[PDB]
């Protein structure tokens, strides 16, 4: 059995940690909703 617990307000935060790259990827989406790399 599954339950929910509130974890926070949905708010932009000034001086949040700023990380991650911005990759451009060719992808395919199948009927089961799984993405795959089209290489």
């Amino acid at each position: 059995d599954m339950y929910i617990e509130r974890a926070g307000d949905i708010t932009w935060e000034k001086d949040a940690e700023v990380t991650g790259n911005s990759p451009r990827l060719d992808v395919a989406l199948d009927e089961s909703g799984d993405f795959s790399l089209v290489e």
Partner: protein, 156 residues
Amino acid sequence: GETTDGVYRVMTRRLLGSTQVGVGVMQEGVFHTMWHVTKGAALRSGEGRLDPYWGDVKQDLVSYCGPWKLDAAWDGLSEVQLLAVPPGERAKNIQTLPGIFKTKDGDIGAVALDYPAGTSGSPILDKCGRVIGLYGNGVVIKNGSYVSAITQGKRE
């Protein structure tokens, strides 16, 4: 149940201890998560029940109590924030510039960040705190890291 707007954890007891299977968004009385988190099952909030209203395995999305309410879109230019809610850890804002998933049916924002699978359905925000989609459907890359589609529904 609790029906204040905000970001929730999705928990199960069907395993060892209490396990966080995913995350979701409460907005205008509707609970929004990814289909792979709940597999379309009912949810408890207090002694309240939340019943599935809308779902799509291909979009990997599901709404509870009503129709999908979140319609904001990535601009295609500006940084965004993942409001990542990881298992056993406090909600945290991580700011990033999305790349792109190029598909035959169009381009889609993507966010290049690793977190446990129980993070799934964390909301992605724009500068005005609007939810532009849910994190935790995407693709593994050469490095073995995850890259997630910015996955948005449609509001009728």
